[model samples]
Target: SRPEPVQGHLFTYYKDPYCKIPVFMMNMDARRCVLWVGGQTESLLSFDYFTNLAEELQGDWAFVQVEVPSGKIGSGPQDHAHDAEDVDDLIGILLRDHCMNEVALFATSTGTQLVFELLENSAHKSSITRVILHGVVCDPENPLFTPEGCAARKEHVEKLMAEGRGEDSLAMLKHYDIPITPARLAGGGFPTLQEAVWNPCIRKEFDVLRRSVGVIKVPLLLMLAHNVQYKPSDEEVGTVLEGVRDHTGCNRVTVSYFNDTCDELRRVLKAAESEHVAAILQFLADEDEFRTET
Candidate 1:
């Protein structure tokens, strides 16, 4: 299941410079970088489309993925801001250590928060040339995050936390699904994740999320996915798209639509021919295509 052993590419694991969280060097195509911030708290390669994206960009770019705390189920609490710090550390490695000239961000779902928060810092603003985001799924209206829902979800986590199950790897011994704990899923708020547990979906304020994306100085490719499973509503997505366009140039923000469900799209390998991979390739190579939009 490890991403290592791919031919010619240097696939390995390295810790971030600041947070020291383990980062997966999924591929090193030996030029500008396209680091992937995964969309799950349960696993790193939550979206396997990055594999196809890496293959298509072979010999032209480096692809890396940051394994945030959510990826480590056995781990304890960490904030969205913490994840951003870790992401920045890996970007530092790519720029300063690996000698890459610039980095492009390709994030999905929860990784959107990491990408946006990191961009808001202004430290690595110049290091990034573009960003590709899909499945920005944090929705406050989600059933799990509603006022009653959030309180209920936190109750179990609090119970486990009170019993000191912060780091216990032993599960309740249910179906062999990953050995995840409540504390790990109960994500903290900014500064300390005081707001909620990082449940099925994190419920971040739409305005704050918008401003985070607004700080991005580079071109943005926000690919809206047809993910009815756990994605945000049309209004939620439109609000962000409008907010981003307001902050950045309308021409700089590119929007792409995927008709397939998120799961189906995640598994399909023909990315270059019929999906965002090809669009991304075009977006990277073209000089004036994004301004025209589709």
Candidate 2:
């Protein structure tokens, strides 16, 4: 008997097999769908952990592993326009052109930045049904971008630029933090000057994203890992959630944190799962009402 040939998983969805871009799709044949974008340094494979949660919430969804190179922060100060434009283009492909009427987004870490960028860049002003961000960062108070942190980051970039060791600077960045997965650390590495100065349209479209809570008109969930020492400050988290709250007409938002205990973390994940399910169901049931409320 011949050995069985390896077969791609049936849950896989994208049709273009040769596309090197890191989007992974799972088609459920539902009227609506969800798209998940992972963080910086994260690849499509890193989504396995969250896909488990996604499976539980929706019978069919797509996990889009955004193809950001390793060691790159989401935004920077150089060639900001081109970088932002590239991201906007990619998002246009995903949200509007790829499959317009039935898609949503769930962004993590730097992926959240991309999510907001997509919302801002969309010319048609396409909206996602729901967006859930984990270990998110968006404000100056954000632990990753606070003055001290940004200064440290800026200084490191300057050092690399001065020494003509830009690659070394990225290596140092990869070495600095703990990652969601070990595999995320392996790669060709992130952009040097491109993303560093590439501020997404978010700076100009803060109100749009703030209103994306109103526009995308879907349930929004922001999850924080409290036990994770390097996470954002309460004030920073408040800014993002509050932005969503203030812009959206209703207070359908929830902010939950991980407890110090393992048991508590498990409980938190479960509660998050419940909220996640509720949000999607609400959106499917009535997108307009859902958008109107939040």
Candidate 3:
């Protein structure tokens, strides 16, 4: 049998694929909603991870997953800021236009950055019900010792770029970091510099992130992997959340760290999986409360 014609956001990924990121969605009636945004260098075939979770949790809601084409290592186009904008547009198109039900976002690894990028740009600020940030890069400030060493590294990179050695500058980042959840390893494996500046969806002032929490008045959960190769300290995570709480003036935000005692790590993993599904269910049950056009 021939493959059916592509429909919905799933087909748009290929046809009229103006945006680099491929967006896919499943509408389960109109009562519930779930949006899954995956990370950099993601293969389209890997979407099953989200789809299976969606099906398991759809009970009565819709599920959508978008795969941003963040390009392979050293293969992505040079425009770091523009790359981020493309991902931002994907989310905007989904939330502002496609999503009719209450929305919940689940972002894993580098995808978490994309999620934050979109939320910062979304005009419908109050529409998002909850956000799950997994293995997020919680430290935006340089606070390490031999603290002078960190400043020198930043200077070195800036110097490289000043000399028109942007690629070398980027290479330095890749050698050391790749965004991942607390559950995974850390290193600059993904396009960090590009993500920092290439994406237009980013906030104009890096400081605005401190204010973002003030704008979002929904339940925000931060789940960190325990003992991930390059895990953020609990204090670091708390600092970020505290900033968010201060900005939003709401107490709905919270953070959780994975435990590695005995099989606690495995248990934590299972709980994360369970919560991912639970978030989907929560969206569906809360769908009717959302106003969907068409």
lDDT of 3 by residue, 1-294 (tens): 222333334645321234334566665455435566555544443433355565565555466666555443332323333444565455456555654546676665566555554566565546577776655232333232123544565565555555655434244543234422211111222222122221111223335444334434666665555334445555654555555555443466555554322131111223344555555445444443442432
lDDT of 1 at 252: 79
Candidate 2 per-residue C-alpha lDDT over 169-287 given as tens digits, one digit per residue, 9 for 90 to 100? 33454323323222221221222201111111223334443433444344555554433333455655566555556665336555555332212111122224444455544544554
State residue 22's C-alpha deviation in candidate 3, in Å.
1.7
Residue 158 of model 2, lDDT score: 54
**All candidates: CA RMSD in angstroms?**
6.7, 8.9, 8.6
lDDT (0 to 1) per candidate: 0.56, 0.42, 0.46
Best by lDDT: 1
Clashing pairs in 2: 70-190, 76-196, 76-197, 76-198, 77-196, 77-197, 78-197
lDDT-based ranking, best first?
1, 3, 2
Which stretches of model 1 miss by more than 4 angstroms?
1-5, 8-29, 41-48, 73-76, 136-142, 145-210, 227-241, 248-251, 263-273, 287-294
Assess every candidate by TM-score: 0.65, 0.55, 0.59
TM-score of 3: 0.59
